[model samples]
Target: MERVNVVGAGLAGSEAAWTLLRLGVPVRLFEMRPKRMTPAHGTDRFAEIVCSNSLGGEGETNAKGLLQAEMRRAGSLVMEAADLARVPAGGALAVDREEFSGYITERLTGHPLLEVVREEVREIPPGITVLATGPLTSEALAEALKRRFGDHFLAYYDAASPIVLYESIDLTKCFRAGRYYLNCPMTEEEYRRFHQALLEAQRHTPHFEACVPVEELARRGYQTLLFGPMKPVGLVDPRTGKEPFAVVQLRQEDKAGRMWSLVGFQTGLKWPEQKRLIQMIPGLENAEIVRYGVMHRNTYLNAPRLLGETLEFREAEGLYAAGVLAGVEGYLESAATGFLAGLNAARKALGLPPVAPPEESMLGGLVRYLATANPEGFQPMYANWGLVPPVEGRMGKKEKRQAMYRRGLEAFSAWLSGLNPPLP
Candidate 1:
């Protein structure tokens, strides 16, 4: 029987492994945690939620939510575990990290046809393989992959927001409201002081001037900062019973409610500088930083120049890439790529014909983007309506979203029916 080797047992890798196994293809799962740790991961568990536990929103009217619905219908293992370990997170599918990881580890380890290997992979396998190594891919393998895929085809640094240890926040000064915006009620005098501090605060020099330009900064507008994560539209200042000029909201980073990250606070400031400046916020005066946000070079391949929709390297048959390493952004997008890679790999190994989902669906749109879309400076992508085929006639955002969801589900159902042997 043919075998498939999947590298990096993270979200995409785990999902790929399960998809292949269910299709009767044996998989060898390789993970590089516990043996060698990444800067973000602290555990040896598989499918670990390195960042936030919420898998986007749960409304079918949203692109990500629609993708999640499709993934679950397609028997996605990651979504399965997420649903099982779900927590009450408003309208999002947030999971208990510990339980979610445990469930995935248990299921993958217990599967009869899958073999889990706990070792660091230093090189890409020569034959049939799927590289789902994620953003924090090991330095050695990352360099090697870059060499073969071209230097411009990968990025290294991620500009992450600072995460705060929940206990350190002064709740009396701050209040939670929603995902993107919050209220930090301040008097006109307070707002003036805050604005002055932000304008005069010292900022670090860019590591690479080419990454962010002075023109971009200038165009961001004087009040852009306030309009961003600091917007205070619906929130009222509890102290004076009035809405403040601005507010700063922190989004929950973990399902355990142990940490919340400063939204839109990606900064180039040094640790001390970050502490000094961030403390300017009323509620964050005594905040303890659990994770300091840093921006680094993030790399990805020119997928249109290197691979096909099936995720196969054009010149290297049977070799495929998935996840962030494959240039797809977001957890769900990465897993969706893995599904395509695993399915195609199995089909190729079995001498079966290639299968690509309909272009109207998010899964198909992703494949199309990586394989044949305009490659002019390709960057990491998240699922959006722009990636999907447009519905004819002008429609409202909500109605358009519903139409896309319906189209995707129907197309996928048809594709499933056309399988050589109908899915069980």
Candidate 2:
């Protein structure tokens, strides 16, 4: 029987290993934890939850939700583990961190065909390999990848926000609402005080000795900060007839309902500074921060330059990349790539023809983006409706998204029918 080697036992690598094992192939799983630790990980467990626990939104109309549905159809081990350990989190699929990791570790260790190896891979091994080392890849291996793939092909640094313990939050000053946001009513004077404090608050220097050049930071756009988690549009204060000048919303970070992260609050501010500055928000004055927001260098390949639809390096047939390293961002997106990579890797070993889903499907759209999108200047990509092939008729963004999602689901179903395990 043919054997395969997988590096970095994060979510993607674990999923890939399970897929191959189920296909009756032997796998050597390499994890670099007890050996060498990343800034984020604290244990030797496979599929460590470094950041948020919730996968993403869960509405069928949402992109991530649809991707999760597709993964379940494909028999995702990670998803199965998550379901068993899930906790009620409103509309999202959130899991208990310890339970989730424990489940994955237990199942993989018991799998008869899988062998777990605890060691850091400083260099890529020969033969069929799946590189799913995620964002916090080791420095030595990252450098080697850079040398082979070109200097401009990799990126580093991911800014993430802090999460707060829910019990410590002053709910009297906050409220729940989405899209058309709902918030605690803030008077004009209250708004001014918060805005002033934010502008005058001190920020921490980058952990990297050299600051990101002013020119490079400037390219991120002055208004980019206001566009995402900071955007206050659609949200209203029931007490007042209009929206507050600006507002900060808290998003659930864990399934326990015990914590919520400060949306758009990713910063390099020192721990004390973060506690002091963020307290300026009306409701967070007495809030206890469970985890301080921190920034780390994240790296990825320029997929357009190195990968084909099968996630194989165009120059190296037996090698493949998955997860963050493949230039696909977010939890679900990484898993999607791993699913396809496993399928293709098995097909290669079995001497079967390579199969790719139709471009109209979410799964196919992501592979197409990695394999064919312009690589002249590529960055990490998250799953979005825009990536799906556009529908033919004119319609608003909402209507178009609905139409595209329907088409994607249908296309994915058809693609699954043609796979080894045909849909029932």
Candidate 3:
């Protein structure tokens, strides 16, 4: 059988290969690791979880959980491997980085019908294929994509969070966790000081600006982290029975629970300056910094103009994209995109139209966002309640999320049931 080409064996590509293989479609899995590397990637393993080890959350009410639930109903290889490699993380589905990637690596490599190619793909290969090259697509291939799609399709600049040793955390001032998170709680006074310190912290500035400075976000005159990652919405301290002025969540990084990663703490601060300022937080004082936050430029497609709900190129007959390169963030969304793209590509190879889950499904909403989101100032998307089909009635955040979850599951199940043969 002529194999389908699945480029870039990261989370998306690996899942794509698995999906195709199970569908009885052969795959040529391309990986550039070891031969070439990106600034953020340190591994040669397939399905390497770089940004965070936690696949968002495990509860059905959360969008990540809902998506994973939907994936399970349709049978997802990534979710299967995650369950096997899971570790204790208050509520999120955390994994042992080594084992998680290792498991999938072995499975994909061991598959009789899949071919693992070790070279970087500089040009978009011929034949039916899925491109999951992600944010760090190789230089030549990126140039090829840019030239092919026109200048407006790509973007750059992505920041990463730092990781710290679990033993280095000062638990005396930090609480273990609550229903949704484990983070450092800060008093109003402490929060103000930290906020001020952030404005003064030394950051790596751009060219010609040898001296540097920057934080918040500008929706309001000064309203900032309150809306982004630093938002303390889902947390409450047991001691106070109240949420703190702000919180810094640390996600579990390994199956051993020895390492914790800063969640939503992307930054561009210089190392020495970052260390000096990192201690300004309430409980992170004296914390041992294992991985300092590093910022890198990531190129991605504007997506909305480049893809459709089917994940197929409008201008090209057989081209498709997935993962971060497809305009979504988070592990679940990335792998989800790959799953759909791979499946659709295989169907196309068999002379059938592409298939899409219900737009009411989490997968449907996600794919719709990629195709319909405004290309103007388009940003990376994360799995959230907003992305799922909206729920009716005047409900609080929790109840509304629960409704979305229920709706998403029903739609996904219905969609999966309609798939004749359930494979290519």
Candidate 4:
């Protein structure tokens, strides 16, 4: 029987292989860990988790929690292993690394329809395949993809600014600079203090200077920011009736104004310092950060222009992209894309039409964001309430999230039950 080829055996690839096998589709699973290892991995385990063990909060109102619920409904192998190896993490889901990866390796290797290949894929596999090679993709394969897709299609660096909830901003302190930006005016004294803190803050070294870190830009000179990102030009402060010494501008990130991104605040500051420095700006004193700024080496596609909601490339029929390579962040978000890609691949091989989750569902919302977000400044996104649609009527932040979660779960349940052959 012909089989689907799954590249990489990380969380995403493991879930993809398992899903295909569960759907009665044979899978050739590839792992480059034991023989050829990335700098991050220390084991030959199928899904070695780096960074952190916690899978995020488990509250129903939380986006990650809702995604976990949806994945459970779809019979996700990653979620299954996570649950079995789960440790007490209070409100979040944490797992025993050894048992978690062990269970996955055992189940996948023991499966009748699975064939494990312990080698690196230097080129994109031919036939029906799931491309789940993550952030640390091999140089050979990344080069192959770059040659195939235009030079601008793949971004090697993941430099992104922190995003904050719009409702959390102290709008009273901000003045509209124009139709697009919300300006937070700062006095000379305030700017000096902020400058000192930024210079003294801890940071990670950048890979290269193509996209300069905000702090590094600040280090050029005391007056550098006055002419760069914080340039207080063409606007008079509503309170002072004169131009401030420096200003921080915020641009709306989404259509509904639920989220906003700092205009040019990409930095390598530690999370706590980012929070502290951000709070120092007027109007953001109580800002709730939806996504923190990160400057790291990553290999991800420009998903908005290349992928569809089903995660299949628009120009490629049988090839699907999943995991961080597909422009999703976090472990479970990557796995969620893998589950969807595998399911759709199985359906296609079975001569059934591919299906996408309803827009109200968390997975669906995320995929849609990746597909429809502006291709100009596209970045990898994780599961968050900001990705999901807001409720119709006005309500507090807590209440609004509750309503969104309820609506999403209802839509997901209906969609799952309606699928033919049912979920495994």
Candidate 5:
């Protein structure tokens, strides 16, 4: 097979490259960074993680966690690197961002089948190619895509949380210090007690705020915050001497002890809510809020209309789209799409028909949703069990989810082993 070309060496692109390389296909991976910069990325490394370090929940009951398990069984390079760079986050799989990207970068560039190209891909080239440009695609490439997509193209806003010095947080009264993260343990009694006050806390909303809302995140469940921004996975609270049920982490802003921001607290939150959120943490009760987060925008396409079952463009079979640009939300979703696109790209290179996973699998359900979601009101989505068809008969939520897990994995295992055969 000929070398598959992949643009944008982010999570999706990198994953695609890895898949093709492992399949005995050569890959030409392109990256536009250091020379050209995006607002969210601070490094030139491949698969760099922006925003939170977490890849999210690890249990089968958690939708994303189940996806991770599936990816691991499917030989996902992203999942492999993630496991190597894994850190404790309760049930979520968090990573050391630098190390995570570093490991993937080293492995890909070092591979004999891979050719690392450092340049911006402003135009789509001829022959088989995968567009895994992610949420922050270059303007030139976006314009090129616009021509193909016509007015069917669409966009939405996204943002990232901020950082502040670890010292300014008043470690005396707040969390632990001199570590990659600071833990602010929480108790059930204090959880609601503080939540009610936060509801009334004074806030400042920006004129152009359009990212994920903290309230929306919080409303997912009381535990969302704990599983997300305030995750305290590996900490034991040597000083407090208890598990403390929940804790907020202050991610290290720099190697020097100069800064660490409130984890996962974003620009959409009223600045006061951030302060309130911080104050409610166990040791941070008497702390001063350092900085409110900032806002940023990440746009995506209405992918269902344009992408084929194997992630190829309907107008042009050889061009495939991946990642957030493909309308899949979250890092894992993006990487999964990349894996599919890469596999298909390789198959195309070999003069073989591309394949898509079964409709019953998570990967299949995701692509099917992207390709067939209600077009009139289409929007980006995350991987959740609800997207999958439910089981028959009466059952509790837990039992139902457990049933879905069994059904999905059983189907997935068969598909992976090629028992059902790939679609022609």
Candidate 6:
């Protein structure tokens, strides 16, 4: 069989190569590292994690934990490296960065079927390829993609604002000033207190300057946000027949109104701080954040428009996308998508049909969202219980999660065993 090209030796690319090699297909893995570097990376190591070391929760009840279990069931090399590099972090799977990357680097590089290439990939390689360049893709390649797929093929900034479950919103504290947005009216005291909290919120240092954090904007002046995202100029509190001091607009994220995002709330605030500040707003006192606001230089493709559930590109067969570039966020999610891309790319090379993961599984749920989500305002997403299909019958949160975990595991295991090659 022809050698498959796996670009960018991040978690996704490395995982893809490993999977293909395991499937008896040779691979050429590319890494533009020591030769070239992304702003966030300092080393040329394969699968280098530039962000948090935590791989999230380690029990099945958690969304990411369940996804990890699924990946392990699939014999994921990334998961193997992570397990070997494990560190103490309560119930979360944290790892020793150096050891994790070192293990992956040695194991993958020593593989007889794998050839490591260290250089920038300016153009897509010939034949089957898994593009897992991740959130920090190089400028030249990103440009090349633009030429091939058009200007809107990729997103340069990770400016997704926080999303909240629709049911968590306090309807009485919100009113529709228009068809598109739900306005949360705030009194002068509430606005002032919220503004103070925003100023005091712990935040990460901004990477991309184009998208300013909501907290930083608030720091400019007391009225800056009032005139900006919090402007209540056109909105009137229906119950009082007067405009409130400020308004935080919530825009619908889905047709069913299951999710709503805070308009113009792109932020670098720490997750906990973001939750605290967000809950301070009217109508969000008990908000359940489905996705957090983030400000970073994450270059990801608009997956819904360009990719399939198999992680293969729609217009270009044999060419696949994985990782954040394919719109799955986080380290493990990237590697999981990489596993699928590798499996599919290898299958394509061998003249076999590509397969999709079971939809009941967290990994499959993320892939499904990437392929079929509303493309209008698509943003990269990570695993969350909210992404999975709800279980039947009313039960407490803990009970429901446990039920979903059991179902997901059973379906995934069954599917894995039924696969043509069958996962070892």
> For model 2, how does the per-residue alpha-carbon lDDT over 94-163 read when each residue is reduced to its tens digit?
8888888888888888999888888888887788888898988888778878887778877675454666
Model 1: lDDT of residue 388: 64
lDDT of the candidates, in the order given: 0.74, 0.72, 0.77, 0.87, 0.73, 0.87
RMSD (CA, Å), each prediction: 12.6, 11.6, 12.0, 2.6, 15.0, 2.3
lDDT of 4: 0.87
lDDT of 4 at 192: 93
TM-score of 3: 0.71
Worst 10 residues of 3 by lDDT: 207-216
317, model 5: CA deviation in Å?
0.9
Q: What TM-score against the true fold does each predicted structure earn?
A: 0.70, 0.69, 0.71, 0.91, 0.68, 0.92
Steric collisions counted per model: 12, 4, 1, 0, 6, 0
Q: What order do you get sorting by lDDT, best first?
A: 6, 4, 3, 1, 5, 2
TM-score of 6: 0.92
How accurate locally is residue 155 in candidate 1, as Cα lDDT from 0 to 100? 63
lDDT of 3 at 280: 79
lDDT value for candidate 3? 0.77
Candidate 5, 1-424: lDDT as tens digits: 3578999999999999998887778999999986888878889899999878899688766667767877887788889889999998887999988889999999999999899889999888777899888778888888888876875575644343544434346565445643335766667777676555545555555443334555555655676666665555666666676555666666653223344555656645666666666666666655544334545355677776788768888888888988988877789988888988988887887778878877667787778777765454345556666456667668765787678777787777777788222322
372 Cα displacement, candidate 1 (Å): 2.5
lDDT string, candidate 1, 100-180, tens digits: 989989998999988878888888886678988887888888888788877766667555566665655788887656532
Give me candidate 2's TM-score against the actual structure.
Answer: 0.69
What is the C-alpha local distance difference test score of candidate 5? Answer: 0.73
